Coordinates of N, CA, C and O in Angstrom, one line a residue:
Chain J
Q1 N 125.1 96.4 92.2 CA 125.3 97.6 91.5 C 123.8 98.3 91.6 O 123.2 99.7 91.8
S2 N 122.6 97.5 91.2 CA 121.2 97.6 91.3 C 121.0 97.1 92.7 O 120.1 97.7 93.6
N3 N 121.8 96.9 93.7 CA 121.7 96.2 95.1 C 121.8 97.7 95.4 O 121.0 98.1 96.6
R4 N 123.0 98.9 95.2 CA 123.0 99.7 95.7 C 121.9 100.7 95.6 O 121.0 100.9 97.0
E5 N 121.0 100.6 94.3 CA 119.8 101.4 94.0 C 118.6 100.9 94.5 O 117.8 101.5 95.2
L6 N 118.5 99.6 95.4 CA 117.6 99.1 95.8 C 117.5 99.6 97.1 O 116.7 100.1 97.7
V7 N 118.5 99.0 97.9 CA 118.8 100.1 99.5 C 118.6 101.3 99.3 O 118.0 101.7 100.6
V8 N 118.9 102.4 98.5 CA 118.6 104.1 98.7 C 117.2 104.0 98.3 O 116.7 104.9 98.5
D9 N 116.7 103.5 97.6 CA 115.2 103.3 97.5 C 114.4 103.2 98.9 O 113.4 103.7 99.4
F10 N 114.6 101.9 99.6 CA 114.0 101.8 101.0 C 114.2 102.8 102.0 O 113.1 103.1 102.2
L11 N 115.2 102.7 101.9 CA 116.0 103.6 103.2 C 115.3 105.3 103.0 O 114.7 105.8 103.7
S12 N 114.8 105.6 101.8 CA 114.4 106.8 101.3 C 113.0 107.1 101.8 O 112.3 107.7 102.0
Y13 N 112.5 105.7 101.1 CA 111.0 105.7 101.9 C 110.8 105.5 103.0 O 109.9 105.8 103.5
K14 N 111.6 105.0 104.2 CA 111.6 104.6 105.2 C 111.1 105.9 106.0 O 111.0 106.5 107.1
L15 N 112.8 106.7 105.5 CA 112.9 108.5 106.2 C 112.0 109.3 105.2 O 111.7 110.0 106.2
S16 N 111.2 109.1 104.5 CA 110.2 109.6 103.9 C 109.0 109.9 104.7 O 108.9 110.8 105.2
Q17 N 108.8 108.7 105.4 CA 107.7 108.5 106.3 C 107.3 109.1 107.7 O 106.8 109.1 108.1
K18 N 108.8 109.2 107.8 CA 109.2 110.3 108.9 C 109.8 111.3 109.1 O 109.6 111.8 109.6
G19 N 109.0 111.9 107.3 CA 109.4 113.4 107.1 C 110.9 114.2 106.8 O 111.3 114.9 107.3
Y20 N 111.5 112.9 106.9 CA 113.1 113.2 106.7 C 113.3 113.3 105.3 O 112.9 112.0 104.3
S21 N 114.4 113.7 104.4 CA 114.4 113.9 102.6 C 116.1 113.2 102.6 O 117.2 113.3 103.4
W22 N 116.1 111.7 102.2 CA 117.2 111.1 101.6 C 118.0 112.1 101.3 O 119.5 112.2 101.3
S23 N 117.5 113.3 100.3 CA 118.8 114.3 99.8 C 119.5 115.1 100.9 O 120.3 115.9 100.4
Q24 N 118.9 115.4 101.8 CA 119.6 115.8 103.2 C 120.8 115.4 103.6 O 121.5 116.0 104.8
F25 N 121.0 114.0 103.0 CA 122.3 112.6 103.6 C 123.1 112.2 102.4 O 123.6 111.3 102.7
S26 N 122.6 113.0 101.7 CA 123.9 112.3 99.8 C 124.1 113.0 98.8 O 123.4 114.6 99.3
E27 N 109.5 96.4 87.0 CA 110.8 96.1 86.7 C 111.7 95.5 87.6 O 111.3 94.5 88.8
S28 N 112.4 96.5 87.7 CA 112.9 96.5 89.3 C 112.6 97.4 89.5 O 112.4 97.6 90.9
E29 N 111.5 98.2 89.2 CA 110.4 98.9 89.7 C 109.4 98.2 90.6 O 108.6 98.5 91.8
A30 N 108.9 96.7 90.4 CA 108.6 96.1 91.2 C 109.1 95.3 92.1 O 108.2 94.7 92.8
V31 N 110.7 95.5 92.3 CA 111.1 94.9 93.2 C 111.1 95.8 93.8 O 110.5 95.3 95.3
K32 N 111.5 97.2 93.8 CA 111.2 98.6 95.1 C 109.9 98.0 95.4 O 109.7 98.2 97.0
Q33 N 108.7 98.3 95.3 CA 107.5 98.3 95.8 C 107.1 96.9 96.0 O 106.6 97.5 97.5
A34 N 107.5 96.1 96.5 CA 107.1 94.8 96.7 C 107.9 95.3 97.7 O 107.3 94.6 99.4
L35 N 109.3 95.6 97.7 CA 110.3 95.4 99.4 C 109.2 96.6 100.3 O 109.5 96.7 101.1
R36 N 109.4 97.9 99.6 CA 108.9 98.9 100.7 C 107.3 98.3 101.1 O 107.1 99.0 102.2
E37 N 106.8 97.2 100.5 CA 105.5 97.1 101.0 C 105.4 95.8 101.9 O 105.4 96.1 103.3
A38 N 106.9 94.6 101.8 CA 106.6 93.9 102.7 C 106.8 94.7 104.1 O 107.0 94.2 104.8
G39 N 108.3 95.8 103.8 CA 108.5 96.2 105.0 C 107.8 97.0 106.1 O 107.5 97.4 107.4
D40 N 106.4 97.8 105.3 CA 105.5 98.2 105.7 C 104.5 96.9 106.6 O 104.4 97.7 108.0
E41 N 104.4 95.9 105.6 CA 103.4 95.3 106.6 C 104.5 94.8 107.6 O 103.9 94.4 108.9
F42 N 105.7 94.3 107.4 CA 106.6 93.6 109.0 C 106.4 95.4 110.2 O 106.3 94.6 111.2
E43 N 106.6 96.3 109.7 CA 106.6 97.4 110.8 C 105.0 97.3 111.3 O 104.7 98.0 112.7
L44 N 104.2 97.2 110.7 CA 103.0 97.0 110.8 C 102.2 95.9 112.0 O 102.0 96.4 113.4
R45 N 102.4 94.9 111.6 CA 102.5 93.6 112.0 C 103.0 93.5 113.5 O 102.9 92.6 114.5
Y46 N 104.2 93.6 113.7 CA 105.1 93.5 114.7 C 105.3 95.8 115.6 O 106.2 95.7 115.4
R47 N 104.6 96.2 115.5 CA 104.5 97.9 116.0 C 105.3 97.5 116.7 O 106.0 99.2 117.2
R48 N 105.0 97.3 117.8 CA 105.0 97.3 119.4 C 107.0 96.9 119.3 O 107.5 97.7 119.5
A49 N 107.1 95.8 118.7 CA 108.6 95.6 118.7 C 109.4 96.7 118.1 O 110.4 96.9 118.5
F50 N 109.0 97.0 116.7 CA 109.7 98.1 115.9 C 109.4 99.6 116.3 O 110.2 100.3 115.7
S51 N 108.8 100.1 117.7 CA 108.3 101.5 118.2 C 109.7 101.6 119.2 O 110.7 102.7 118.9
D52 N 110.6 100.5 119.3 CA 111.8 100.6 119.8 C 112.8 99.8 119.4 O 113.4 99.3 120.3
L53 N 112.8 99.6 118.2 CA 113.8 98.7 118.0 C 115.2 98.8 118.4 O 115.8 97.9 119.1
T54 N 115.5 99.9 118.4 CA 117.2 100.3 118.1 C 117.6 101.1 119.4 O 118.7 101.3 119.5
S55 N 116.7 101.3 119.9 CA 117.1 101.5 121.3 C 118.0 101.6 122.3 O 119.2 101.9 122.3
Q56 N 118.0 100.1 122.3 CA 119.0 99.5 123.2 C 120.9 99.1 122.7 O 121.2 99.2 123.2
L57 N 120.4 99.8 121.4 CA 121.8 99.9 121.0 C 122.6 100.6 121.6 O 124.0 100.5 121.2
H58 N 122.2 101.8 121.7 CA 123.0 103.2 121.7 C 123.7 103.2 121.0 O 125.3 103.3 121.0
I59 N 123.2 103.5 119.8 CA 124.4 103.9 118.5 C 125.1 105.3 118.9 O 124.7 106.2 119.7
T60 N 126.3 105.3 118.5 CA 126.9 106.7 118.3 C 128.0 106.0 116.6 O 128.0 105.1 116.8
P61 N 128.6 107.3 116.2 CA 129.5 107.0 115.5 C 129.9 106.3 115.1 O 130.7 105.3 114.4
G62 N 131.1 105.8 116.8 CA 131.7 104.9 117.2 C 131.3 103.3 117.1 O 132.9 102.5 116.4
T63 N 130.5 103.2 117.8 CA 129.4 101.9 117.4 C 128.8 101.5 116.6 O 128.8 100.2 116.6
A64 N 128.4 102.4 116.0 CA 127.4 102.1 115.1 C 128.2 100.8 113.9 O 126.6 99.8 114.1
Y65 N 128.9 100.4 113.0 CA 129.4 99.7 112.5 C 129.2 98.5 113.0 O 128.3 97.2 112.7
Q66 N 130.3 98.3 114.4 CA 129.8 96.6 114.9 C 128.8 96.6 115.6 O 128.1 95.4 115.5
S67 N 127.8 97.5 115.7 CA 126.5 97.1 116.3 C 125.6 96.5 114.6 O 125.3 95.2 115.3
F68 N 125.6 97.1 114.2 CA 125.0 96.8 112.5 C 125.8 95.6 112.5 O 125.2 94.5 111.9
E69 N 126.2 95.6 112.3 CA 127.4 94.4 111.7 C 127.4 92.7 112.7 O 126.9 91.9 112.4
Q70 N 126.8 93.2 114.1 CA 126.3 92.2 115.3 C 125.2 91.5 114.4 O 124.7 89.9 115.0
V71 N 124.4 92.5 114.6 CA 122.4 91.9 114.5 C 122.5 91.2 113.2 O 122.0 90.5 113.2
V72 N 123.3 91.7 112.1 CA 123.2 91.1 110.9 C 123.5 89.8 110.4 O 123.0 88.8 110.3
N73 N 124.9 89.5 111.3 CA 125.1 88.2 111.5 C 124.8 87.0 112.4 O 124.4 86.2 111.6
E74 N 123.7 87.8 113.3 CA 123.0 86.7 114.3 C 121.7 86.4 113.2 O 121.1 85.3 113.4
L75 N 121.6 87.5 112.8 CA 120.2 87.1 111.8 C 120.3 86.1 110.8 O 119.0 85.5 110.8
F76 N 121.7 86.0 110.0 CA 121.7 85.2 109.0 C 122.6 83.7 109.5 O 122.8 83.6 108.8
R77 N 123.0 84.3 110.7 CA 124.3 82.5 110.7 C 123.4 81.7 110.9 O 124.3 80.8 110.1
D78 N 122.0 81.2 111.0 CA 121.9 79.7 110.8 C 121.2 79.6 109.4 O 120.0 78.8 109.3
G79 N 121.1 80.6 108.9 CA 120.7 80.7 107.2 C 119.9 82.0 106.7 O 119.2 83.2 107.3
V80 N 119.4 82.1 105.7 CA 118.6 83.0 104.5 C 117.2 82.6 104.3 O 116.8 81.2 104.0
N81 N 116.1 83.7 104.7 CA 115.1 83.2 103.9 C 114.5 84.7 103.3 O 115.1 85.5 103.8
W82 N 113.5 84.9 102.9 CA 112.5 86.1 102.2 C 112.3 87.2 103.7 O 112.4 88.3 103.4
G83 N 112.0 86.7 104.6 CA 111.5 87.0 105.9 C 112.7 87.9 106.4 O 112.7 89.0 106.9
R84 N 113.9 87.1 106.2 CA 114.8 87.0 107.2 C 115.6 88.8 106.5 O 116.0 89.3 107.2
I85 N 115.6 88.5 105.1 CA 116.0 89.8 104.3 C 115.4 91.1 104.9 O 116.4 91.9 104.6
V86 N 113.9 90.5 104.7 CA 113.1 91.9 104.9 C 113.3 92.4 106.3 O 113.2 93.3 106.4
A87 N 113.8 91.7 107.1 CA 113.6 92.1 108.8 C 115.3 92.9 107.7 O 115.4 94.0 109.6
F88 N 115.9 92.4 107.4 CA 117.4 93.3 107.2 C 117.1 94.8 106.8 O 117.7 95.2 107.5
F89 N 116.4 94.6 105.9 CA 115.5 96.1 105.4 C 115.1 97.3 106.5 O 115.2 98.0 106.8
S90 N 114.3 96.4 107.0 CA 113.5 97.0 108.3 C 114.3 97.5 108.9 O 114.3 98.7 109.7
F91 N 115.5 96.7 109.7 CA 116.5 96.7 110.5 C 117.2 98.5 110.2 O 117.4 99.1 111.0
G92 N 117.6 98.4 108.9 CA 118.7 99.3 108.3 C 117.9 100.9 108.2 O 118.2 101.6 108.6
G93 N 116.7 100.8 108.1 CA 115.2 101.7 108.1 C 115.1 102.4 109.5 O 115.4 103.7 109.6
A94 N 114.8 101.7 110.3 CA 115.0 102.3 111.8 C 116.0 102.5 112.2 O 116.2 103.5 112.8
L95 N 117.4 101.8 111.9 CA 118.8 102.7 112.0 C 118.8 103.9 111.3 O 119.4 104.5 112.1
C96 N 118.7 104.0 110.2 CA 118.7 105.5 110.0 C 117.8 106.4 110.3 O 118.8 107.4 110.7
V97 N 116.4 106.3 110.8 CA 115.5 107.2 111.6 C 116.4 107.5 112.5 O 116.5 108.4 112.9
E98 N 116.5 106.5 113.3 CA 117.6 106.5 114.5 C 118.5 107.7 114.3 O 118.3 108.9 115.6
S99 N 119.1 107.5 113.8 CA 120.5 108.3 113.3 C 120.1 110.4 113.5 O 120.5 110.6 113.9
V100 N 118.9 109.9 112.5 CA 119.0 111.3 112.0 C 118.4 112.0 113.9 O 118.1 112.8 113.9
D101 N 117.2 111.1 114.3 CA 116.2 111.7 115.5 C 117.4 111.9 116.5 O 117.4 112.9 117.1
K102 N 118.4 111.1 116.2 CA 119.3 111.6 117.5 C 120.6 112.3 116.6 O 121.2 112.8 117.5
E103 N 120.4 113.1 115.8 CA 121.0 113.8 115.2 C 122.6 113.6 114.7 O 123.7 113.9 114.9
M104 N 122.6 112.3 114.8 CA 123.8 111.8 114.3 C 123.9 111.6 112.7 O 124.0 110.6 112.2
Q105 N 123.5 112.2 111.4 CA 123.4 112.4 110.3 C 123.8 111.1 109.7 O 123.8 111.2 108.8
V106 N 124.9 111.8 110.1 CA 127.0 111.2 109.5 C 126.2 109.4 108.9 O 126.6 109.0 108.0
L107 N 125.3 109.0 109.8 CA 125.4 107.3 109.6 C 124.6 107.3 108.3 O 124.8 106.0 108.2
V108 N 123.7 108.0 107.8 CA 122.7 107.5 107.3 C 123.4 106.7 105.9 O 123.0 105.9 105.5
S109 N 124.5 107.7 105.4 CA 125.2 107.2 104.1 C 125.8 105.7 104.5 O 125.9 105.5 103.7
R110 N 126.5 106.1 105.3 CA 127.5 104.6 106.1 C 126.7 103.5 106.7 O 127.0 102.6 106.0
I111 N 124.9 103.8 106.6 CA 124.3 102.3 106.6 C 123.9 102.0 105.9 O 124.3 100.7 105.3
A112 N 123.6 102.7 104.2 CA 123.5 102.6 103.1 C 124.3 102.0 102.7 O 124.3 101.1 102.1
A113 N 125.8 102.4 102.6 CA 126.9 101.6 101.9 C 127.5 100.2 102.7 O 126.9 99.1 101.8
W114 N 127.1 100.0 104.5 CA 127.1 98.5 104.9 C 126.2 97.8 104.2 O 126.7 96.6 104.3
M115 N 124.5 98.0 104.4 CA 123.7 97.4 103.8 C 124.2 96.5 102.5 O 123.8 95.9 101.7
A116 N 124.7 97.7 101.5 CA 124.9 97.4 100.3 C 125.7 96.4 100.1 O 125.7 95.3 99.3
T117 N 127.0 96.8 100.8 CA 128.3 95.3 100.9 C 127.6 94.0 101.3 O 127.8 93.3 100.7
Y118 N 126.8 94.8 102.6 CA 126.3 93.1 102.7 C 125.4 92.4 101.9 O 125.3 91.0 101.5
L119 N 125.0 93.0 101.4 CA 124.1 92.7 100.5 C 124.8 91.6 99.2 O 124.2 90.3 98.9
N120 N 125.2 92.5 99.0 CA 126.6 91.8 97.6 C 127.2 90.6 97.8 O 127.3 89.7 97.3
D121 N 127.8 90.5 99.4 CA 128.6 89.7 99.9 C 127.9 88.3 100.4 O 128.7 87.7 100.1
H122 N 127.0 89.1 100.6 CA 126.6 87.7 101.8 C 124.8 87.4 101.3 O 124.7 86.4 101.5
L123 N 124.2 88.1 100.7 CA 123.3 87.7 100.4 C 122.2 86.9 99.4 O 121.6 86.1 98.6
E124 N 122.5 88.0 97.9 CA 122.6 88.1 96.6 C 123.2 86.4 96.2 O 122.3 86.0 95.3
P125 N 124.4 85.4 96.7 CA 124.5 84.4 96.3 C 123.0 83.4 96.4 O 122.3 82.8 96.2
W126 N 122.8 83.5 97.7 CA 121.6 83.1 97.8 C 120.4 83.4 97.7 O 119.4 82.2 97.0
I127 N 120.1 84.9 97.2 CA 119.1 85.4 96.3 C 119.1 84.7 94.9 O 117.9 84.5 94.6
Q128 N 120.3 84.3 94.1 CA 120.3 83.8 92.8 C 119.9 82.6 93.1 O 119.4 82.0 92.4
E129 N 120.7 81.8 94.0 CA 120.5 79.9 94.2 C 118.8 80.1 94.4 O 118.3 78.9 94.8
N130 N 118.1 81.2 94.7 CA 116.7 80.9 95.1 C 115.2 81.7 94.1 O 114.5 81.9 94.7
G131 N 115.9 82.1 92.9 CA 115.1 82.4 92.1 C 115.0 83.8 91.9 O 115.2 84.2 90.8
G132 N 116.0 84.7 92.5 CA 116.0 86.9 92.1 C 114.9 86.8 93.3 O 114.5 86.3 93.4
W133 N 115.1 88.0 93.1 CA 114.1 89.0 93.4 C 112.7 89.0 92.9 O 111.6 89.2 93.2
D134 N 113.1 88.8 91.6 CA 111.6 88.2 90.4 C 110.8 86.9 91.7 O 109.6 87.2 90.8
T135 N 111.5 86.1 92.2 CA 110.9 85.1 93.2 C 110.3 86.3 94.0 O 109.0 86.3 94.7
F136 N 110.7 87.1 94.8 CA 110.5 87.7 96.1 C 109.0 88.2 95.7 O 108.1 88.1 96.3
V137 N 109.4 89.0 94.4 CA 108.0 90.0 93.3 C 107.2 89.1 93.8 O 105.7 89.3 94.0
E138 N 107.0 87.8 93.5 CA 106.0 86.8 93.4 C 105.3 86.7 94.9 O 104.0 86.2 94.7
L139 N 105.9 86.2 95.3 CA 105.4 85.5 96.6 C 105.1 86.8 97.8 O 104.0 86.4 98.3
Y140 N 105.7 88.0 97.8 CA 105.3 89.3 98.3 C 104.9 90.4 98.2 O 104.7 91.6 99.0
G141 N 104.5 89.8 96.9 CA 104.0 91.3 96.0 C 102.8 91.8 96.1 O 102.1 90.2 96.1
Chain P
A1 N 125.4 91.8 124.1 CA 124.4 91.3 124.1 C 122.9 92.2 124.0 O 121.9 91.0 124.1
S2 N 122.6 93.2 123.8 CA 121.5 93.8 123.7 C 121.8 93.5 121.8 O 120.4 93.5 121.5
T3 N 122.6 93.3 121.2 CA 122.7 93.2 119.7 C 122.2 91.7 119.3 O 120.9 91.7 118.4
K4 N 122.9 90.8 120.1 CA 121.6 89.6 120.4 C 120.3 89.2 120.2 O 119.4 88.7 120.0
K5 N 119.4 89.8 121.2 CA 118.3 90.6 121.5 C 117.3 90.7 120.6 O 116.7 90.2 120.0
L6 N 118.2 91.3 119.8 CA 117.8 92.1 118.6 C 117.4 91.4 117.8 O 116.4 91.3 116.8
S7 N 118.4 91.0 117.3 CA 118.9 90.6 116.1 C 118.0 88.9 116.1 O 117.0 88.1 115.3
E8 N 117.9 87.9 117.7 CA 117.0 87.0 118.1 C 116.0 87.3 117.7 O 114.7 87.0 117.1
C9 N 114.8 88.9 118.3 CA 113.8 89.7 118.0 C 113.4 89.5 116.0 O 112.9 89.0 115.7
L10 N 114.2 90.0 115.4 CA 114.3 90.3 114.1 C 114.6 88.9 113.5 O 112.9 89.0 112.4
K11 N 115.0 88.0 113.7 CA 114.8 86.2 113.0 C 113.2 85.9 113.8 O 113.0 85.7 112.9
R12 N 113.3 86.2 114.9 CA 111.4 85.5 115.2 C 110.3 86.3 114.5 O 110.3 85.4 113.7
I13 N 110.8 87.7 114.0 CA 109.5 88.1 113.3 C 109.3 87.8 112.0 O 108.7 87.3 111.4
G14 N 110.5 87.7 111.1 CA 111.0 87.8 109.9 C 110.8 86.3 109.7 O 109.9 85.6 108.4
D15 N 111.0 85.5 110.0 CA 110.2 83.8 110.3 C 109.1 83.9 110.0 O 108.5 82.9 109.4
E16 N 108.3 84.4 111.1 CA 106.9 84.5 111.1 C 106.4 84.9 109.8 O 105.4 84.4 109.2
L17 N 106.7 86.4 109.7 CA 106.1 86.9 108.4 C 106.3 85.9 107.3 O 105.8 85.7 106.6
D18 N 107.6 85.4 106.9 CA 107.9 84.3 106.3 C 107.1 83.2 106.0 O 106.7 82.6 104.6
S19 N 106.6 82.9 107.3 CA 106.2 81.5 107.2 C 104.1 81.6 106.7 O 104.1 81.0 106.0
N20 N 104.0 82.9 107.1 CA 102.8 83.4 106.3 C 103.0 83.4 105.0 O 101.7 83.0 104.3
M21 N 103.9 84.0 104.4 CA 103.7 84.2 103.3 C 104.2 82.7 102.1 O 103.8 82.6 100.9
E22 N 104.4 82.1 103.1 CA 104.1 80.4 102.6 C 103.0 79.8 102.6 O 102.6 79.3 101.8
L23 N 102.0 79.9 103.6 CA 100.7 79.4 103.6 C 99.9 80.0 103.0 O 99.1 79.3 101.9
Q24 N 99.7 81.7 102.1 CA 99.4 81.8 101.6 C 99.8 81.3 99.7 O 98.4 81.1 99.0
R25 N 100.8 80.6 99.6 CA 101.3 80.2 98.4 C 100.7 78.9 98.0 O 100.7 78.2 97.1
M26 N 100.1 78.4 99.0 CA 99.4 77.1 99.0 C 98.0 77.7 99.2 O 96.9 77.9 98.6

């Protein structure tokens, strides 16, 4: 629930950084801010990798979900940590941005939905078992 | 196969970022 709002917040931020508006495609504030900031740091320290993140996926509305699912399953196959979670959001951001660049606007809301569902079913259990998001804020804020 | 390389990359980067934030925590 607030997981959905987390996802929309980060994606808005990343979209806004490239001149796009979320609106065109559709405490807890300490968690958002920290995530925004971690994602920025991620994208900065690995700017090269990130300049061409999703190019080689050849995203289409038909293949989108399967590309997304394959990447996220591999990313977490052998475990979760906070940095991998950050990679996850940053990945989602790159994916949205590319969609719009490529004029596949429809994908943005879907991607948001996929991340929200993945977060709820696959990550939140680890998150609770590991302190909740308030821990994230402590370590990465 | 291009999805493997990406997530391998994603995994490598995130694990490193996470490493650093652990060194800081000490």
